[PDB]
Amino acid sequence: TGVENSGAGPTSFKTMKVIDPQHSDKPNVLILGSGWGAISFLKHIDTKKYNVSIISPRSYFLFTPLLPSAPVGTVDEKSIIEPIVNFALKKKGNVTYYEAEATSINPDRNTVTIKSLSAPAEIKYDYLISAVGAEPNTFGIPGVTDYGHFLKEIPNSLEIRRTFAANLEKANLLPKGDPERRRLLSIVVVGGGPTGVEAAGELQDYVHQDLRKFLPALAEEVQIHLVEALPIVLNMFEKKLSSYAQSHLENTSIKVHLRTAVAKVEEKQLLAKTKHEDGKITEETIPYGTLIWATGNKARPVITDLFKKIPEQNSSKRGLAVNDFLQVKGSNNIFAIGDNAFAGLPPTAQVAHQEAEYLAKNFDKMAQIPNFQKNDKIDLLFEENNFKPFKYNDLGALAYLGSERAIATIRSGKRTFYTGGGLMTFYLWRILYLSMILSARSRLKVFFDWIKLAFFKRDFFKGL
Amino acid sequence: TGVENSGAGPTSFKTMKVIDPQHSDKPNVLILGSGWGAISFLKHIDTKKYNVSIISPRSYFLFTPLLPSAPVGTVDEKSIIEPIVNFALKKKGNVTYYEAEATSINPDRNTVTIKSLSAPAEIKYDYLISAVGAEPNTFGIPGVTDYGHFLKEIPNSLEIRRTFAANLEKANLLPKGDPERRRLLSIVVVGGGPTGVEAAGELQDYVHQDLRKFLPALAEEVQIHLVEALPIVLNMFEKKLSSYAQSHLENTSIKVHLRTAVAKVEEKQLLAKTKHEDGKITEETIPYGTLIWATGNKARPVITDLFKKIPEQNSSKRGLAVNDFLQVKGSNNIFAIGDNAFAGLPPTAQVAHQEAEYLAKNFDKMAQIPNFQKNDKIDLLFEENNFKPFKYNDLGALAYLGSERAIATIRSGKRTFYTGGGLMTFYLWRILYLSMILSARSRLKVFFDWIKLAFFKRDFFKGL
Ligand SMILES: Cc1cc2nc3c(=O)[nH]c(=O)nc-3n(C[C@H](O)[C@H](O)[C@H](O)COP(=O)(O)OP(=O)(O)OC[C@H]3O[C@@H](n4cnc5c(N)ncnc54)[C@H](O)[C@@H]3O)c2cc1C
Ligand SMILES: Cc1cc2nc3c(=O)[nH]c(=O)nc-3n(C[C@H](O)[C@H](O)[C@H](O)COP(=O)(O)OP(=O)(O)OC[C@H]3O[C@@H](n4cnc5c(N)ncnc54)[C@H](O)[C@@H]3O)c2cc1C
Ligand SMILES: CO/C(=C\C(N)=O)[C@H](C)[C@H](/C=C/c1csc(-c2csc([C@@H](C)/C=C/C=C/C(C)C)n2)n1)OC
Ligand SMILES: CO/C(=C\C(N)=O)[C@H](C)[C@H](/C=C/c1csc(-c2csc([C@@H](C)/C=C\C=C\C(C)C)n2)n1)OC
Ligand SMILES: [Mg+2]
Ligand SMILES: [Mg+2]
Ligand SMILES: [Mg+2]
Ligand SMILES: [Mg+2]
Ligand SMILES: [Mg+2]
Ligand SMILES: [Mg+2]
Ligand SMILES: [Mg+2]
Ligand SMILES: [Mg+2]
Incomplete structure (x- = not known):
């Protein structure tokens, strides 16, 4: 669903930027998170051709590399956070932030299920961008x-x-x-x-x-x-x-x-x-x-829950194993970047920042393709039109x-x-x-x- | 000290500045609060001729005028506060702060009982500077x-x-x-x-x-x-x-x-x-x-507590009434300044920053008169000395x-x-x-x- 007048996290706000039709003209891309991945990925993507939606429990973005300077107040905690909102006032077309959290992603029924603690209640997605991050690891210690x-x-x-x-x-x-x-x-x-x-x-x-x-x-x-x-x-x-x-x-x-x-x-x-x-x-x-x-850093429930619902992902542990175009191995319209994607790469910002920026620009590529306005193997269309596979520049x-x-x-x-x-x-x-x-x-x-x-x-x- | 904790809460700091003989001959002075009156009085008191100690549950001074610009982030809440320690660190002699609240002043036993929310437990004093502020008032609505x-x-x-x-x-x-x-x-x-x-x-x-x-x-x-x-x-x-x-x-x-x-x-x-x-x-x-x-604003309950324990303050509704030498009418060694003092002036901060500076110079002006320690219209002691009274330069x-x-x-x-x-x-x-x-x-x-x-x-x- 994902319609008017529900209850997720209360900054479920819509910013009516350009003038669209009610008959759905663009693909609905839905981003999960508001960290390095999601903010980097949002920061570039063509909002004129896509209908960006964001699901984050957190409503700001965290400049993680100065966090260790916050506790003693070398830096104030405000001094290093930014609301999602301000990055969306920098997107030409339409955005929507739900302030909730992904719980079960439903790959084939084709929604992310948001249940918050500040209330269906699912969100339809044409494409999915899954940058929820990793949660820290205790090792059962x-x-x-x-x-x-x-x-x-x-x-x-x-x-x-x-x-x-x-x-x-x-x-x-x-x-x-x-x-x-x-x-x-x-x-x-x-x-x-x-x-x-x-x-x-x-x-x-x-x-x-x-x-x-x-x-x-x-x-x-x-x-x-x-x-x-x-x-x-x-x-x-x-x-x-x-x-x-x-x-x-x-x-x-x-x-x-x-x-x-x-x-x-x-x-x-x-x-x-x-x-x-x-x-x-x-x-x-x-x-x-x-x-x-x-x-x-270990994987999150959303993701470790997803592992089962995709036969290929049964036995991935670190994150979601991704092909060279950063789609989930086993799903068409689902992508993964940064800490929750298992690219065989450093789990860093730099990686997620690139990972996102590349994927962002590849989204501009696919709009030019009538073939992507409609159509269980998946990669095929990326080869037919000669897409560069992602390689990392540490x-x-x-x-x-x-x-x-x-x-x-x-x-x-x-x-x-x-x-x-x-x-x-x-x-x-x-x-x-x-x-x-x-x-x-x-x-x-x-x-x-x-x-x-x-x-x-x-x-x-x-x-x- | 040592270890004089019994009533007073955590941030009981002490600065061992001057060399103090256990058995002291400097008088001992007590400031109640950490706001306009108290911090003003702290600033201008000679910490060599006197020994000053403070009681306030609040470990910071508050620039009260700017408060209303914090709720909407016109200004950060940290930007308008400053710690007591930070003021007491720029003094000559020994300052001490028992982070707590006075619960009862004891006029005829020369002590202020302090029951910190965070923990006998009296504090002894030669002189008392009561400047706790007032609390806001609902008019029983x-x-x-x-x-x-x-x-x-x-x-x-x-x-x-x-x-x-x-x-x-x-x-x-x-x-x-x-x-x-x-x-x-x-x-x-x-x-x-x-x-x-x-x-x-x-x-x-x-x-x-x-x-x-x-x-x-x-x-x-x-x-x-x-x-x-x-x-x-x-x-x-x-x-x-x-x-x-x-x-x-x-x-x-x-x-x-x-x-x-x-x-x-x-x-x-x-x-x-x-x-x-x-x-x-x-x-x-x-x-x-x-x-x-x-x-x-209305009268704090410690101030109302101390209306019953002095015959002059028995019909004291608004606040401790004081003479032109800012002394609690009915006590010798206690002084009231700021919104807890009913000096028939408006309850401004402006008043209190004067009320203090003045009293500090008085207190300094009690350092060329060696009779006060070898001491019923006890304002005469100041009048015969020829003490300039207090006047408000609005x-x-x-x-x-x-x-x-x-x-x-x-x-x-x-x-x-x-x-x-x-x-x-x-x-x-x-x-x-x-x-x-x-x-x-x-x-x-x-x-x-x-x-x-x-x-x-x-x-x-x-x-x-
Ligand atoms: C203290 C610290 C310092 C660091 N310093 C550096 C550094 O100097 N250099 C460097 O390269 N890397 C650094 N890193 C690592 C780097 O920040 C991470 O690899 C990077 O954050 C990964 O980005 P991401 O988008 O994958 O996940 P994150 O940036 O963690 O973003 C995940 C986002 O998803 C949201 N979210 C969480 N759960 C859900 C859910 N269920 N549904 C929807 N949204 C959800 C979160 O609020 C967050 O906005 C640091 C990490 C930490 C903790
Ligand atoms: C939002 C706001 C804005 C204002 N702006 C202005 C302005 O622009 N100009 C102006 O002239 N006036 C202003 N005022 C009024 C003025 O600030 C007060 O008259 C002034 O603060 C009085 O100072 P004080 O030292 O008497 O008490 P305060 O400045 O309130 O300080 C009292 C201190 O006592 C402490 N305390 C309280 N109870 C106890 C206890 N039992 N034991 C120990 N400590 C205690 C408090 O934590 C505090 O540190 C403002 C007031 C407010 C609320
Ligand atoms: C903004 O874009 C960038 C540079 C630029 N000129 O614009 C960079 C990509 C920028 C900086 C990245 C950066 C700076 S400094 C750094 C770093 C320090 S250390 C590290 C890795 C090797 C550590 C990983 C630890 C992982 C654990 C979770 C196991 N990365 N990464 O991205 C945030
Ligand atoms: C310049 O320094 C000061 C004194 C000095 N140097 O002697 C002042 C104490 C200064 C500013 C005082 C000030 C600024 S603005 C003001 C004022 C006038 S009036 C008022 C209201 C808010 C408070 C109470 C009113 C009570 C009744 C009259 C209604 N505030 N007082 O310090 C904060
Ligand atoms: Mg982040
Ligand atoms: Mg992210
Ligand atoms: Mg993470
Ligand atoms: Mg991630
Ligand atoms: Mg104050
Ligand atoms: Mg005060
Ligand atoms: Mg006050
Ligand atoms: Mg006062």
């Missing part, structure tokens, strides 16, 4: 999600402060010696990837740069462990850099735990195992005030290390433009992250956020 | 607390935005010609002092500027009413100005209800009554989605109106510098306010707020 914080989404950032704020508080009522005070003030990040390292760093920044400047008795006793399973951190960088980073984290009093896996999280301590290069399996408990879980990797330092690589093709570095690198990272932001609103807010951060402390209000 | 929203404190801003969004949301799923949609978009501000005005003003902005740019279907139907019991809005501005303000309010589509009083408040609607030129009371139902009740009256306009009136004694005006006044007004802000950080943040507003919309997130 018990205790996470009882006692952990995922660094995924804006609320997650608010939860992490409120927690750390509350510990800083409780902690400052105990006599200096007390171990408990020592515990409250400890931080465990679990995740050696960029996210974790950046959170790890951004906290330690705050503690050195801000906290001590008015309660130095606490600053000291703050401890920030960073825990990773593999031989070293930042594995996407060439060995020589990953080391400089690990140098600089420990330089900033970070307790890096390489080759270490979390077997279980209890309330106050997380039982860790370590397997050394001389294969010796040692144990260790790590007590924690605040636990951050910056690791992994552009390199940035990561921020703490107390004003960074490392990076940039590339195009086999060519490898640049690679830092230290305090210089920092200013590119800033200058570069700025440019990759998808809105002038957001960028000015972040810009102002860093200028403000020079003259003054971060804003660490627990109720805001 | 049934319904206000249930369905209404005060506009007194930061959380109230979030409460309103949340409310208004949820209605904008719920309304857009109903068809243009529904009553229930008309209602949800109705907005009644009760009380036409510059608050209710500026508020009403700043909403209509968001409707007229933000909302319409993406839902004119909703925007148009949004109605803002301003109810006021008196002949005119903004009585403290001179007669001719009150009419131009009202001209401009009504001319920006704001239904202004003079000589009108809210007899009661129900969920969907509020019954109001209006006395006419001819002295005949009519009735009326105003149905409403959002109810901002910005009218009249600096004026400001009020923003909506849609880029403002009214103003700077003066001193009689010598009136100015009285506008239009788009020029809005600019001055901005400038005056921006100057009167108490911290660099607040200022800058407020300054970048306004810039971002010219470039981009406002920020109306219902979870941030």
Whole structure:
């Protein structure tokens, strides 16, 4: 259905841009999500030839690479989100955002089922764009999600402060010696990837740069462990850099735990195992005030539910396996991009950003084809008209290390433009992250956020 | 300290500045609150000759004038607050803040009982500076607390935005010609002092500027009413100005209800009554989605608690009555300033920023007279010393109106510098306010707020 006067998420709003007919003139494309995929895919697609619809529980778009800077308020949570709406005021034709969530996609009955928590109730789709993202992975390691914080989404950032704020508080009522005070003030990040390292760093920044400047008795006793399973951190960088980073984290009093896996999280301590290069399996408990879980990504119910309803997708695990034109293997009119598509690619923004932009332009290709105005094998039409299959141009990797330092690589093709570095690198990272932001609103807010951060402390209000 | 926690809540910070002999000879001074009076008094007290400690459940100062511009993201709630610590960090001597609330003042036992919501538990004092503010008042009109929203404190801003969004949301799923949609978009501000005005003003902005740019279907139907019991809005501005303000309010589509009083408040609607030129009371139902009740202050219960414990304050209705030396009539060592003090002046912030600065210089002027500590018309102690009493240098009256306009009136004694005006006044007004802000950080943040507003919309997130 998907008609007038229902109840999904209340920003089920329609923007009557151009002048269409009531007899359906265009294909109804329906996007799932409002993140990198869906916003990148929306940002380009020809709205004159297609009737774009978006289904997102979230009504803003998240510039994920600056999220780890939110909790301490290096950046404000607003300063890095954008409403979907503003990207639709930049589309010539017609859009509609339902503020709900996909639940079961019904591939052959040909709808996405939106049931919200803010109320049929399905939505007809001619084509489907499935960029819902991955949800983070605990590995069945018990205790996470009882006692952990995922660094995924804006609320997650608010939860992490409120927690750390509350510990800083409780902690400052105990006599200096007390171990408990020592515990409250400890931080465990679990995740050696960029996210974790950046959170790890951004906290330690705050503690050195801000906290001590008015309660130095606490600053000291703050401890920030960073825990990773593999031989070293930042594995996407060439060995020589990953080391400089690990140098600089420990330089900033970070307790890096390489080759270490979390077997279980209890309330106050997380039982860790370590397997050394001389294969010796040692144990260790790590007590924690605040636990951050910056690791992994698994598939979502919508998708793992879909796996069954498409014979080819029975045994895909990571995401939806996709052919070279990014359609679901097993379905005609259903596509998948970014973290929920299994392209055999890095699960990153860069990939999803390209993935979407290519698919966007291929949608302009198909409109020129009368053959696509109507018609269980599927790819055929993409060959008959000579469509380029998607190939990826991995552009390199940035990561921020703490107390004003960074490392990076940039590339195009086999060519490898640049690679830092230290305090210089920092200013590119800033200058570069700025440019990759998808809105002038957001960028000015972040810009102002860093200028403000020079003259003054971060804003660490627990109720805001 | 040490460990003096028993009543007082978490952010019990202490700055170990000067070297303190356990057994002290400096007097001990207590400031109740963290707003205009208290923070003004904190700023100008000599922290070397005295020892100052504070009690406030609120860990931040609030630039109360800008509050009404936060609910519609004209300005961020963080931009207008600044922490106590941040002020106390720029002092000479030892400051301490027990983040809690006074529950009982104990005049004849020299203590203030503090039961923090977050936890004996008395605090000892030589001198007491009672500056807790007043609370807002319902005049026992049934319904206000249930369905209404005060506009007194930061959380109230979030409460309103949340409310208004949820209605904008719920309304857009109903068809243009529904009553229930008309209602949800109705907005009644009760009380036409510059608050209710500026508020009403700043909403209509968001409707007229933000909302319409993406839902004119909703925007148009949004109605803002301003109810006021008196002949005119903004009585403290001179007669001719009150009419131009009202001209401009009504001319920006704001239904202004003079000589009108809210007899009661129900969920969907509020019954109001209006006395006419001819002295005949009519009735009326105003149905409403959002109810901002910005009218009249009343006596805090700690202040009312302390009316029974002093014979002079037995017939004290409005607030603690004080002499020309701002001292609680009937106590020696307690002082009341701000809206908890009934100094027969208006309950402005302007008053309190004077009431403080003055008392601080008094307090400093009690550092060349070594008899007070070797001490029934106890104001004579000051009169015989030849203490200049307190006099209010009324600096004026400001009020923003909506849609880029403002009214103003700077003066001193009689010598009136100015009285506008239009788009020029809005600019001055901005400038005056921006100057009167108490911290660099607040200022800058407020300054970048306004810039971002010219470039981009406002920020109306219902979870941030
Ligand atoms: C803290 C953090 C920092 C990162 N930093 C970087 C970086 O610096 N560089 C980099 O390349 N990558 C980074 N990433 C990874 C990158 O952001 C992701 O790979 C990218 O977000 C994938 O985009 P996507 O569109 O596939 O999914 P997302 O961007 O996650 O978008 C998924 C969207 O779908 C919505 N949604 C969820 N469930 C449903 C449902 N059932 N129905 C409808 N909609 C739904 C979500 O609200 C969201 O809008 C980071 C990730 C995190 C968590
Ligand atoms: C939205 C709004 C806008 C305004 N704009 C203006 C304006 O432009 N110009 C103007 O002159 N006036 C304005 N006012 C009025 C003016 O701000 C007040 O008269 C002024 O705040 C009084 O200051 P105060 O120090 O007496 O109390 P406040 O400034 O309210 O501060 C009182 C403090 O006491 C704390 N507190 C309360 N109870 C307790 C307790 N039991 N124990 C400990 N602490 C406690 C509070 O958290 C607060 O920090 C405005 C008021 C509002 C609500
Ligand atoms: C906006 O478009 C872009 C560049 C441009 N000049 O416009 C880029 C595509 C832009 C930047 C991408 C980018 C910057 S920096 C970075 C990065 C750092 S690290 C990483 C990968 C290798 C990490 C993946 C981790 C995955 C886990 C979930 C397992 N990617 N990606 O896309 C967001
Ligand atoms: C310039 O600095 C100041 C004093 C000084 N330097 O001595 C002031 C205290 C300054 C501004 C005060 C101000 C601005 S605008 C205003 C005012 C006049 S009137 C009013 C209404 C809102 C409040 C109460 C009215 C009560 C009855 C008269 C109805 N507000 N007062 O600090 C905030
Ligand atoms: Mg995203
Ligand atoms: Mg997406
Ligand atoms: Mg994702
Ligand atoms: Mg995805
Ligand atoms: Mg205040
Ligand atoms: Mg005060
Ligand atoms: Mg007050
Ligand atoms: Mg007061």
